[PDB]
Structures are given as structure tokens and as C-alpha cells.
Design a protein around this ligand. Structure first.
Ligand SMILES: O=c1ccn([C@@H]2O[C@H](COP(=O)(O)OP(=O)(O)O[C@H]3O[C@H](CO)[C@H](O)[C@H](O)[C@H]3O)[C@@H](O)[C@H]2O)c(=O)[nH]1
Ligand SMILES: O=c1ccn([C@@H]2O[C@H](COP(=O)(O)OP(=O)(O)O[C@H]3O[C@H](CO)[C@H](O)[C@H](O)[C@H]3O)[C@@H](O)[C@H]2O)c(=O)[nH]1
Ligand SMILES: [Ca+2]
Ligand SMILES: [Ca+2]
Ligand SMILES: [Cl-]
Ligand SMILES: [Cl-]
Ligand SMILES: [Cl-]
Ligand SMILES: [Cl-]
Ligand SMILES: [Cl-]
Ligand SMILES: [Cl-]
Ligand SMILES: [Cl-]
Ligand SMILES: [Hg+2]
Ligand SMILES: [Hg+2]
Ligand SMILES: [Hg+2]
Ligand SMILES: [Hg+2]
Ligand SMILES: [Hg+2]
Ligand SMILES: [Hg+2]
Ligand SMILES: [Hg+2]
Ligand SMILES: [Hg+2]
Ligand SMILES: [Hg+2]
Lengths: 520, 518
């Protein structure tokens, strides 16, 4: 008699979470873990926290209490004191006692998974955002013994190495950039994975894996990730990294003598990078992130141009500026296409005689017309209200890490030197890259702006706002990203610089640039 | 790079034990030798209401094997030693039913909480001889599957039918399955005693040993309550008889005794030693010593060829297991005798004898076997043994052999019967009508035509009567000479050679001994 067997229950996963100074990331990080599409009754939690300067253990304790009954089991190993290691130089310094402790901890979680008869153990670093709720299911689907999902960072850094040096050190290989950029998809054999990975405790070879102590043959640096990677070689366990689709994001590690504020702002940029192409990563419905209070970054006004019909560009920028604690005045963009020929003449608008597109040879467009009038209105607002220094934003731009501190420290450097400036580029397209642009003395990270090509973000002074308006550019209409290089006298074509007489604009540019385009 | 093999599935073995010290050495030994990784095996043991030292045997064993297994849970309860609503140790009251259901439910919750793949229930007196039984059960990929355990009777750990009220039901399919005529895994409405639950299956979440399903309207029986639970869960129960798995004692009545259970499980060990080597106990438990008596006889002989070492070791184990002591008599190899030594004893075949089956005359094997019995008949008269039991070396002992045989001889001597021979093992040739019973002596009948000499009781008066006929000059096989002496041999040509056939012969009814191979 045939009788159908019911389905197998999902694999039994232990999620091991080591947390130190993670209160900045846990609301977003733990919310992502809650919403993993894996049955919570087939999931167990293992949490260890210690050496905390922030209220990391308090956030964890509240979250665990809220989700304890949903899971197969929960282990909780806090240690309030000491808040820092006796042999450390700072919270971001990986001393030997911190290496040893974290190794011992991962080993304890590994043993705990073995003792509770779990199929898999999943390590997730407290600052690792597992955005894809299917990541755990997808990693189980690969039937590997140690597999890791390639997480995206702001740079080439990711949670895997492509080469090793037979001494344990990092090593670039030609295949890293292809894997990193997902040009080659799949799962690849690599000598190193870290941060987040899945161990298959069904595999018999996993019984020989060990986070601590180092293997008896280990003769490398006292590094936690190196000790484990060497343990996979001895057990002949091939580590794999998969990039078949997007899984999550992670911040790039900081230097030893960095600070907790660096780390909190570093993870905030991760949230920004997510919001470039995704909705904002939501927090847990049981953890609440602290309320932020913004400012104008010491400016007289921070503008943001936006066309009302581009509603999704508006919400994205407001979420990004809010997350960076930056306040803006929304300026309605001049819809250049909605202006008939009569309203164009009503403002004395005439294209510059003989203008041709640098890459197609076309006259000025209605889009570039409405774009020039948008910046033209802001220049009018600057002169009317007498704002001495203002920052101007557009609606499609991504922010660099530590954007707020980095620009504010330039503005306190430009001010302390009494620089006679009109236009400071926060984001442009540098067109003169043969010889380097002349650096501005006594003001670090600032150069004299040569021929640029964009107006994504810039600082303008009241002096510069009058200079632009006094050149009456409405009758000599030229796209705004070319009219500015005409005003500081670095435009390549001289048939354009001839129509404008006085071109005494003091233009500078932040170096490196603090803002880039979204879709480049 | 090649992925390593998967580990074996995680199995929790659940063991309820009450008054099982008689079986735990042999039973626990069978489990510790299961071909299934101990690191992938966990133990769950609960014991209570013990009148024997069951609790001490388990603790002695668990302490010795704790370090070898993934986990060990241990639930003992010394007081009380019996249920307040019971009529005896073998009576299943509602408190006993309720407690046993709670223990199995507790074992199921344990298996679930420790994330085991399977839970294997094994009754404390179930001898899982086959070390691969666990592996085989897992292989069938069933949610509730049981191995068919052999018993001395038609009883096994499954039913083929069930009534609309939850009672046992015979079906035409039970016997073919029970005798391994139809081999395979069959869907049945009831399995118990030893079975495997697949906790990987989502349906197993709905199984519960306790409490009964809210629709349960049947009797408060532990196995039926579980059976109805799988019905509500739509989980099909299976039993597999593809090969020999293990052995099971047949349950006893509510008013049976502990010694009945102890001796009933001993018979399981005897049954194993028929076609299999002896079932060894755990090398971590000391089996209790046994004191053998002569069962009140003046002597117990065992005939055996010195060359048949295999038969000797098997009998000396079955006897020692039953606390029976025998004097070993070396048989006379009638095949190693040349034609000169045959005449040296004054031996002549009875004129005209031939085998009633293939027509052969008396054989050399049938010669020395008569002489071995002939030499024992002499030692009886020489030593003056009033009552003696005579054994051979290919015997199958019935259940409760020692007590049933002693009770018979006690019923005989208290009645003063003029007896000379009492068969204990034989082939009854009168099968049309039952043989004439002996009044006032239960389980004893007058021996009609019989045909074996497996084992028998012989008196001094009867030991003289055989030798008085002087049979060496007119020799038949010894199993045909006796029916001549009590005058039941159908051949009047043979009986005509013996002038006085005055032997008074009897037999136990039913027989207590049968051959190893029929
Ligand atoms: O004493 C400690 C130190 C760290 N952690 C926790 O362990 C993880 C370490 O992640 P960090 O962000 O603090 O460290 P990095 O981002 O700089 O990168 C890390 O990548 C690996 C972790 O996956 C190795 O730990 C490596 O040495 C280390 O540089 C985090 O979950 C952190 O919260 C602790 O619980 N206790
Ligand atoms: O209070 C108790 C009563 C029983 N048992 C245990 O229950 C198991 C089965 O009991 P028995 O072998 O003594 O009883 P049976 O031989 O008659 O076989 C049983 O077969 C089924 C499955 O075991 C049911 O339990 C049924 O009630 C019963 O007949 C044994 O391991 C016994 O040790 C206990 O641990 N504690
Ligand atoms: Ca990190
Ligand atoms: Ca039993
Ligand atoms: Cl430094
Ligand atoms: Cl320093
Ligand atoms: Cl804002
Ligand atoms: Cl113990
Ligand atoms: Cl049978
Ligand atoms: Cl029955
Ligand atoms: Cl003996
Ligand atoms: Hg690679
Ligand atoms: Hg590794
Ligand atoms: Hg430093
Ligand atoms: Hg705003
Ligand atoms: Hg059947
Ligand atoms: Hg059942
Ligand atoms: Hg003996
Ligand atoms: Hg014989
Ligand atoms: Hg028997």
C-alpha cells in the first residue's frame, strides 16, 4: 500500500552572534535576522556580548526577551565588566587577548551547536546586515561544508579573500574583482571567508573544524580568521563564497586607533548605500533606534533642488539627509518642458550664440533651461536673504562616508585661513586630470577648481552669488554646468568665454570629492 | 573538492524499565552493540515501581556508557514499588497505563527538544539481536515503522486488523507475515513494543502518547491511544519482516508472577540458542550467578558424542541457563567400532528388522546409541538410582521446563503410581485419538506407540525390566525397543522376540522437549 510521507522539517540552524559595541547596528542588524525566511522553531539563538562601552547588552537583552518564545532555544552570555581589554589600545584595536577571547567564543558557539544536534551553525557579525531574507535558505541549498554569502561594502572589501600567501597574509589575485563585481556568478573555492558564513554540521568533515585553539601545525599570526581558515585546510574542508545574487551589506573595518563614532557613522553609510537601490532597511519591531537631531552643518542654509514629479528621488534624499542628521530647504525645480515660448521670452532668455553640445553638437535643451533657472532661483534666494555661505544639493547623488564631519572640517579650515572663495565644489566631473589641479595652500583637501562639468553639490558664498547674477546669463543661456566653468575662466572653448565679459569667480573643489552620482 | 559523507541520523533510544533485571543484561547488551554510531545516539531511561533490582542494573550500566553517547537522561523513582490500584506486578491498572503513556510522551518531548532525527522505543525485555535493525528501520523512510520480533508463539508486536472499537482482529494476512512468507514492509493498524518514529517528518509533530486525542472514545490502553493518535495524524504504521530482527517474550496474564516473567524471558534466550549463538550480556553488567540443582532426581544424565563439541556446548548452556545440573556421559561411537568389537559384546541384530522408511537394516549409528543408553541403564541399577532423568544433545526445552517437570514428578510420587518410563520428548504415533490419561495425575498419559528417545525419566524398577529382556542378542533401534517393552510396537514379528513386555511407560502431555531440527 502506497502512503505519502509528509515533508521534512527545515534544517536546524544555530545563529551565533558575537556582539561588542554594536548598539549602532543591532536595530537594523537584528531586524534582518528576525525576518529571515527560515522557520524560527527550527532556529536557535546563541548570543555572547562583553567589553561594551555602549548599551549593546541592554539592546540585546530587550530583543532576546521579545523573541525568546519564537525560537527553539536561546543562550545568553553577557559580561558587563571590564568594558575594555587590559592589553588594548582602543575599542577598535584587535589585541591578542581580544583575538583569543573571540576565538574561544566562536568555538563555544560551535560546541553549543554540536551539543544541541543542529544541522548548521550560522555566524553573523553584529554589524552585518543580512538584507535578503532568503540568504540562509540559499546557503543551505549549496550543500557546502563552509559557505559564505558575498556581502557588499562601499569598496572592494568583502568577507572573502581570493589568494593567500602561504604565510597567512592577504593576497590579490586576478579573479577577485570579477567575483566582487558579480561579473562571474556562482560559488567559488576560496582560501578565506569570514564575517558571515554557514557551517554544515551534518558533514563528517566538520567534526574536525575548530576556532580555538590553533591546529597543532599552525605556525601563522595570532589572527582569528587565519586560525579558522587553517583549520579548514587541515580538515580538507573547502571554503566557498557565493555571489549568485545580493545577500547583504557590511561596513569596511576601521583602523586600530579609530573611535566608536567612526564605527557608528561607518554603519550609517551602509544604510545609505542600501537606500541607493533599495528601500531603507527597516529595524526590528522590538528594537527602536535612537532619535536623531539634525542641523544645517553650520551653514546659513542647505538647499536641495527637486522636481515635484520625481517623488522617489525626493523621498530617497530626505531619508539620506535625515540619516546623516542634515536638514534642508526643499527648492521646487523649474520644469523646463512646461514653459512655452512666451514664458521663455518673458525673462529675457536667449541661448548663447553658437552653443553646441560637447558630445552631440546640439543647442541648449528645455531640460538644461529649467535646470539653469533652478540654480538661478537659488542664487536669487542667496542674495535676497543675504546668506553668507550655503550648500546646494540636487536630487540624485550618493554620499561619502563621514560626509558631515568631512565637509564641516573643510569649512572650519577654509574659514580659519580667510580664503577669498566663491564656489566650492562638493561633487563634480574633473575634466583636467593630466597635470594635477593646483592645491590650495593652508586648507587641506581643497584644490583650485579647473574645468569641471557637473553641478551635483557645491558650496556658494554671498560674494559668488552676486558675481553669477551680475553676469546676466539669462540673455546668454548656456547650461549651468558650463556657465560656471565660464565664470572661473577655465572653459576650453573661447567662443563661449567671449560672450561673458567679467569672469572673476573664485572656484575651488573638495579633494577627494565628497559626493558622486547615483547611476554615474 | 569532495564533500564529506553526512553523519548518521540522530537517534534517541527510549527505554521504560519496570521489573526487568532478569532481561536487562541480555537486552542492554544487544543495544550497546547496535551498528549505529554512539555519538549519533542518545539514551532516555525511566524506571519506577520495581520489586527487583532493576534500578541498580540500569545505573551500573548508564555510568559505564554515559561517556560514549551523545546524552543520557535518567529518571528513577524508588518509592513506591507498586501501584496503589494494582492487583499484581503484571496487572495493568489505569495508573500504570497513565504513567506509562506519560513516560513515552516525555521521551517523545525529549527527542524533539534535543533535535533528534528519530526516537526508537525498545521495551526492556525486547532482544534486538540484529545489530543492523536500527539502520534497516531508518532505511524504509517511514514515519512510524516497527521491526517484527519473533516469539515462541503467534504473538508479535503488530496487529493486522482493528475493530471499530479498537480491539485486536485476525486477518488472513497475519500468519503469512508472521512466518515471513510475505517479506516486506506492510501497512498495519497497530505496532508496539519496538518501533521507530521519524521526527524529521512534519506529520510526527501531531503524534502524542499522552493525552488521548480529544476524539478518542476507546479503552484507556496505552498502545491503542497511540494507535488512534497516528490515525488522527494520518500517519501510517508499518511493520517490516524482511529479515530476523529480534525476539520478544509473550505477555502474561494480570495475575502472573515475577518469576514467570523471569523464566519466560529465559525461554527467549533458549529459543535464540537453537539456531543462533548465545546472546551475550553487556560487558558492563555482571549477570547474576545461577545455582543448579538436580530437580529432585537421583541423577540427571546427558548423552553426547565426544566429537560433537558443538552440541555439548549448546546443551551445557541451556542447562546452566535453566539452573539445571547434569552428569555428562560420553556416548559410544557405534560407527568407530570394527566388526570384531561388535561381536566382542555379543550383539546380534533382531532377525528380520528393517527401517520402516527406506527399508534399511540396523545401522552402526543406531548401534552405539543403544549402547550409550544401555550403559546408563546399567549405572542406574549399579548406583541404585530410584528416579533419573536422561538427556541427549539436540533438544529444545519448553517454556517453564524445570517447574512443569518437577510438578509432574511431585504429582506422580504423591500418587504412588507404578511407573517405569516417562517420556519427556518423543514422537507420538497415535494421533487419531488422544492417548489414555492417567487418573489423578495431571498432564500425564499412558504412552502408546512412540518413536524417539530425546529425553525420558526412568525408575530403578524399569531399569531392571529392560535389562531382564537381554536385548543385545536381538537388537532394534532404542526408540523401537521401548515400544516393544510396553507392547505398542505394531509389528508382532518384533514383539514376538521378547517374552515379557511388562514395562509401564508414560509421557508428559504436552511434551516438554522437542528436537532442535524437526
Ligand atoms: O571582544 C570582542 C570583539 C568583537 N566582538 C564581536 O565580534 C564581531 C567582530 O566584528 P567587528 O565589526 O567588531 O570587527 P571588524 O569589522 O573590524 O572585522 C572583523 O572580521 C572578522 C570577524 O568576522 C574578524 O573578527 C576580524 O579579526 C575582524 O577584523 C562583531 O560581531 C563584534 O561585535 C565581541 O563580541 N567581543
Ligand atoms: O510502571 C511501569 C510499567 C511498565 N514499564 C515498562 O513498560 C515496557 C513494556 O511493559 P511489559 O513488557 O512488562 O508488558 P508486556 O510484556 O505485556 O508488553 C507491553 O506491550 C506494549 C508495548 O510495550 C504495551 O506497553 C502493553 O501495555 C504491554 O502489553 C517494559 O519495558 C516495562 O519495563 C515501566 O517502565 N513502568
Ligand atoms: Ca564588521
Ligand atoms: Ca514484554
Ligand atoms: Cl595612526
Ligand atoms: Cl600612534
Ligand atoms: Cl532633511
Ligand atoms: Cl547517570
Ligand atoms: Cl508461529
Ligand atoms: Cl493481542
Ligand atoms: Cl550443566
Ligand atoms: Hg577565486
Ligand atoms: Hg574557514
Ligand atoms: Hg595612532
Ligand atoms: Hg529636508
Ligand atoms: Hg496486513
Ligand atoms: Hg501508532
Ligand atoms: Hg552438565
Ligand atoms: Hg539416540
Ligand atoms: Hg520451546
Amino acid at each position: 500500500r502506497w502512503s505519502p510521507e509528509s515533508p521534512l522539517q527545515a534544517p536546524r540552524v544555530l545563529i551565533a552572534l558575537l556582539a561588542r559595541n554594536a548598539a549602532h547596528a543591532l536595530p537594523t542588524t537584528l531586524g534582518a535576522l528576525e525576518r529571515l525566511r527560515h522557520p524560527r522553531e527550527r532556529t536557535a539563538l546563541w548570543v555572547a556580548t562583553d567589553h561594551n562601552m555602549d548599551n549593546t547588552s541592554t539592546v540585546l537583552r530587550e530583543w532576546l526577551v521579545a523573541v525568546k518564545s519564537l525560537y527553539h532555544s536561546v543562550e545568553w552570555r553577557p559580561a558587563e565588566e571590564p568594558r575594555s581589554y587590559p592589553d588594548e589600545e582602543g575599542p577598535k584595536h584587535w589585541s591578542d587577548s581580544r583575538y583569543e577571547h573571540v576565538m574561544k567564543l566562536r568555538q563555544a558557539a560551535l560546541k553549543s551547536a554540536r551539543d544541541m544536534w543542529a544541522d548548521y551553525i550560522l555566524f553573523v557579525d553584529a554589524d552585518n546586515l543580512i538584507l535578503n531574507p532568503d540568504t540562509l535558505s540559499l546557503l543551505i541549498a549549496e550543500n557546502k561544508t563552509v559557505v559564505a554569502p558575498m556581502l557588499d561594502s562601499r569598496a572592494a572589501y568583502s568577507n572573502f579573500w581570493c589568494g593567500m600567501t602561504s604565510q597567512g597574509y592577504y593576497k590579490r589575485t586576478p579573479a577577485y574583482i570579477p567575483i566582487r563585481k558579480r561579473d562571474r556568478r556562482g560559488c567559488f573555492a576560496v582560501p578565506m571567508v569570514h564575517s558571515t558564513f554557514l557551517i554544515d554540521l551534518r558533514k563528517a568533515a566538520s567534526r574536525n573544524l575548530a576556532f580555538y585553539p590553533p591546529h597543532p601545525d599552525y605556525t601563522w599570526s595570532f589572527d582569528d580568521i587565519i586560525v579558522f581558515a587553517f583549520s579548514c585546510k587541515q580538515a580538507e574542508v573547502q571554503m566557498y563564497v557565493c555571489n549568485k545574487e545580493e545577500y547583504g551589506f557590511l561596513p569596511v573595518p576601521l583602523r586600530a586607533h579609530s573611535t566608536l563614532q567612526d564605527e557608528a557613522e561607518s554603519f550609517m553609510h551602509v544604510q545609505l548605500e542600501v537606500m541607493v537601490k533599495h528601500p531603507p532597511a527597516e529595524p526590528s519591531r522590538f528594537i527602536s533606534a535612537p532619535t536623531k537631531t539634525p542641523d544645517k552643518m553650520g551653514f546659513d542654509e542647505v538647499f536641495m533642488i527637486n522636481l515635484r514629479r520625481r517623488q522617489d528621488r525626493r523621498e530617497r534624499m530626505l531619508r539620506a539627509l535625515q540619516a546623516q542628521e542634515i536638514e534642508c530647504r526643499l527648492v521646487e525645480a523649474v520644469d523646463g518642458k512646461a514653459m512655452n515660448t512666451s514664458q521663455v521670452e518673458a525673462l529675457g532668455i536667449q541661448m548663447l550664440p553658437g552653443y553646441r553640445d560637447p558630445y552631440h553638437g546640439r543647442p541648449l535643451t528645455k531640460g538644461e533651461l529649467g535646470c539653469f533657472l533652478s540654480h538661478y532661483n537659488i542664487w536669487k534666494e542667496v542674495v535676497d536673504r543675504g546668506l553668507q555661505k550655503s550648500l546646494v544639493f540636487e536630487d540624485d547623488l550618493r554620499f561619502e562616508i563621514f560626509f558631515k564631519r568631512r565637509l564641516m572640517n573643510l569649512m572650519r579650515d577654509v574659514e580659519r585661513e580667510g580664503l577669498d572663495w566663491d564656489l566650492i565644489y562638493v561633487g563634480r566631473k574633473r575634466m583636467q586630470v593630466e597635470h594635477p589641479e593646483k592645491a590650495v595652500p593652508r586648507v587641506r583637501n581643497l584644490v583650485e577648481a579647473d574645468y569641471s562639468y557637473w553641478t551635483l553639490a557645491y558650496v556658494i558664498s554671498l560674494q559668488g552669488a552676486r558675481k553669477l547674477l551680475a553676469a546676466e546669463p539669462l540673455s546668454k543661456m548656456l547650461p549651468v554646468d558650463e556657465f560656471l566653468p565660464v565664470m572661473f575662466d577655465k572653459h576650453p572653448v573661447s567662443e563661449y568665454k567671449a560672450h561673458f565679459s567679467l569672469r572673476n569667480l573664485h572656484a575651488f573643489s573638495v579633494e577627494p570629492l565628497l559626493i558622486y552620482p547615483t547611476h554615474y
